[PDB]
Amino acid sequence: AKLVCYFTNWAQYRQGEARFLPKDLDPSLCTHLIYAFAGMTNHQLSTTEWNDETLYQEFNGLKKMNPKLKTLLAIGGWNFGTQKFTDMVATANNRQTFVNSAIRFLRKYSFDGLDLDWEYPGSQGSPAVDKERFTTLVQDLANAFQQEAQTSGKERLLLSAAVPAGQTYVDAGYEVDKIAQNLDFVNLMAYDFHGSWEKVTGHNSPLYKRQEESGAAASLNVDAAVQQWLQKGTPASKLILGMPTYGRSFTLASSSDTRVGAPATGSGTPGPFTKEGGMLAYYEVCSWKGATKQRIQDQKVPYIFRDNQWVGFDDVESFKTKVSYLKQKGLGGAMVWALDLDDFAGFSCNQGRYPLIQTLRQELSLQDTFCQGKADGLYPNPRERSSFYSCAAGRLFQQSCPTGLVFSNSCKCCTWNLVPRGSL
């Protein structure tokens, strides 16, 4: 299982106890750490913060304490917008300039791969052609990453992508089946489903639909987003379920109507640290005094309200529920946005350091010719213990075992690993 955690390079600017600094990084907490963000200049990869180069060394320096730990560098995000992606992907030459710069940059700074965070191909200013050109970008990077690994001798650079949960964005920019074959893993942004852009209270990251929802709204939830990415061609083993360590906040029309779906007049009051109306870090919500917390029964996530302020957020219970679901669906693990929004310093929630992300950590720990002319049956994955190959009429399929089970040829099944006999 993977635990993919995002680092943000502007969290160093928050005040007081919310300030996230190099010491706050825990190299043992996640399996993959991703640096948000890099930007782009003249179609080449570039820093976005005056001290990025210093931060890169601290960041990848984490691998000396944990050398299982892999690191990636993310490009794009909210602030980046789209136009630079659009200009880079348009011509095969511009794409080339980027891909080469990318490889140079990542080796130069000790990153193990690249995470694409374009928001989004085919949306906002991005033209319809950017959908297929994004496929081409992903292909090119996968190509050039593969050849660098032969030539250089070292391990191939990883390639991942952070992908939207909304069908409108997915349809407009993502050829799912294609890109999924090239991406090492797929970071599903299963949050921002509801927020203060809408006129009524809604949860940021609900697990299931509410009984009363219909139309498009019925798919604005984690389960529908997961099935969407599965049905459209993503292997479960590559689908990483994003979790948010922030909630989204509303100002209610009336303090007497606090239901999910209650009229809201706009964003909730900015948090003392994040200072962005409409959202709150977990550390800003977890210890609200004199508030009333409730759980949404159908959606398995909590909300909290106090006077005219209402916030939907994720807690320890909901992260556990989401990991159960995740494993029940055979997903490749969990992704989290973001490290600096969890109570990383244990100063607020009285739950220790990283209570949300630790919850994920704990709960996560509980060819094309090969199958011919084989008979129908199961075969092991020579490169992997918890995966296997099924042959069906000459055709190969790759499946994974349930979490905490291994493939044994003796039962042609996934089962328990062999038991020790009073060993060291």
Side-chain angles (χ1 to χ4, degrees):
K2 296 181 178 52
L3 178 38
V4 184
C5 303
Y6 278 95
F7 170 85
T8 68
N9 71 348
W10 61 90
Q12 51 169 336
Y13 301 127
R14 297 203 182 102
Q15 286 146 356
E17 311 90 318
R19 178 158 280 130
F20 192 95
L21 291 176
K23 56 173 239 176
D24 290 308
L25 299 151
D26 179 352
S28 191
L29 173 76
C30 311
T31 60
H32 301 67
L33 297 193
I34 300 187
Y35 196 110
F37 287 102
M40 217 180 57
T41 300
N42 291 320
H43 318 303
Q44 290 177 93
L45 200 47
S46 58
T47 51
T48 62
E49 286 298 311
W50 67 276
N51 62 337
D52 267 337
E53 296 91 337
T54 292
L55 294 175
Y56 292 168
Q57 293 191 344
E58 299 271 48
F59 195 67
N60 300 310
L62 292 172
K63 286 182 273 178
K64 286 144 196 161
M65 298 186 120
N66 183 13
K68 295 264 183 58
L69 187 61
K70 305 311 190 342
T71 59
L72 293 88
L73 179 60
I75 183 185
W78 177 72
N79 320 63
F80 197 73
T82 61
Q83 192 62 52
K84 283 183 181 193
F85 280 113
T86 294
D87 292 337
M88 183 263 294
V89 302
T91 78
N93 279 335
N94 289 345
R95 286 176 237 141
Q96 173 183 62
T97 301
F98 178 67
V99 181
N100 296 314
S101 76
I103 304 181
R104 287 193 294 273
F105 197 94
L106 298 163
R107 295 308 189 184
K108 184 192 176 168
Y109 294 116
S110 269
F111 283 109
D112 299 310
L114 179 78
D115 185 46
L116 301 173
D117 287 47
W118 185 346
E119 296 185 10
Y120 302 96
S123 302
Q124 310 300 293
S126 169
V129 295
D130 278 353
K131 174 179 180 175
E132 294 211 25
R133 290 171 172 188
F134 182 77
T135 295
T136 296
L137 170 58
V138 165
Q139 182 61 60
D140 296 337
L141 284 164
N143 286 341
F145 280 5
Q146 165 221 312
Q147 208 181 263
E148 195 266 1
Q150 288 195 67
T151 299
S152 61
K154 32 181 62 172
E155 298 218 65
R156 187 179 67 204
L157 289 165
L158 307 177
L159 182 66
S160 59
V163 298
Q167 59 175 310
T168 300
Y169 304 125
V170 176
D171 278 353
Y174 303 81
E175 292 189 285
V176 176
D177 41 334
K178 300 188 172 161
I179 59 165
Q181 285 308 296
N182 294 323
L183 293 169
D184 296 286
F185 53 102
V186 170
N187 301 297
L188 176 58
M189 294 183 283
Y191 37 70
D192 308 322
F193 280 109
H194 293 301
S196 57
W197 50 95
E198 302 162 323
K199 281 163 43 70
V200 296
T201 58
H203 201 275
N204 179 46
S205 185
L207 190 49
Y208 303 113
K209 63 187 67 169
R210 276 191 298 126
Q211 290 164 32
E212 332 88 74
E213 286 169 324
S214 69
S219 305
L220 292 176
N221 58 85
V222 173
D223 172 48
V226 168
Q227 294 177 230
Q228 180 184 192
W229 282 82
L230 294 179
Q231 288 289 73
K232 284 178 178 167
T234 313
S237 61
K238 279 185 179 186
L239 193 60
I240 319 296
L241 176 55
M243 319 267 184
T245 51
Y246 64 96
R248 287 208 175 272
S249 60
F250 297 79
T251 300
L252 297 175
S254 172
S255 53
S256 71
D257 189 359
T258 62
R259 323 185 311 262
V260 194
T265 67
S267 54
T269 303
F273 292 112
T274 52
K275 298 177 166 171
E276 180 174 292
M279 68 84 68
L280 290 175
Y282 177 67
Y283 59 70
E284 294 169 315
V285 62
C286 67
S287 59
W288 261 23
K289 299 316 196 321
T292 308
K293 179 171 186 203
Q294 308 222 10
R295 317 196 69 83
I296 309 172
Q297 300 276 42
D298 287 328
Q299 308 196 298
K300 315 310 182 189
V301 289
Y303 62 97
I304 188 173
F305 62 84
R306 182 180 59 195
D307 303 319
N308 70 353
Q309 296 301 305
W310 189 106
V311 185
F313 67 100
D314 269 84
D315 62 1
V316 171
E317 180 182 351
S318 73
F319 271 21
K320 284 188 200 177
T321 304
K322 293 183 176 176
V323 174
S324 294
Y325 169 88
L326 177 168
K327 301 188 295 197
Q328 196 83 291
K329 299 284 303 217
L331 308 186
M335 171 269 279
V336 57
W337 187 281
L339 293 153
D340 51 85
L341 300 174
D342 190 3
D343 192 5
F344 63 89
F347 88 104
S348 187
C349 310
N350 188 39
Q351 282 172 315
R353 304 192 185 258
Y354 289 112
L356 296 191
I357 303 187
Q358 281 293 356
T359 299
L360 296 175
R361 199 191 154 175
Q362 298 169 15
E363 301 286 329
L364 281 175
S365 300
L366 300 161
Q367 320 103 240
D368 196 278
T369 186
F370 173 78
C371 285
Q372 38 184 332
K374 304 287 192 294
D376 287 5
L378 302 76
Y379 303 85
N381 195 0
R383 191 186 314 127
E384 192 161 317
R385 295 270 45 246
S386 311
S387 299
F388 59 102
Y389 296 177
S390 85
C391 288
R395 288 269 303 265
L396 181 135
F397 292 92
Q398 305 183 81
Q399 303 192 253
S400 289
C401 293
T403 294
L405 292 190
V406 289
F407 182 78
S408 183
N409 204 282
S410 64
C411 66
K412 295 305 214 293
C413 80
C414 293
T415 183
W416 297 112
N417 230 320
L418 292 178
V419 70
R421 209 174 278 117
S423 54
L424 185 90

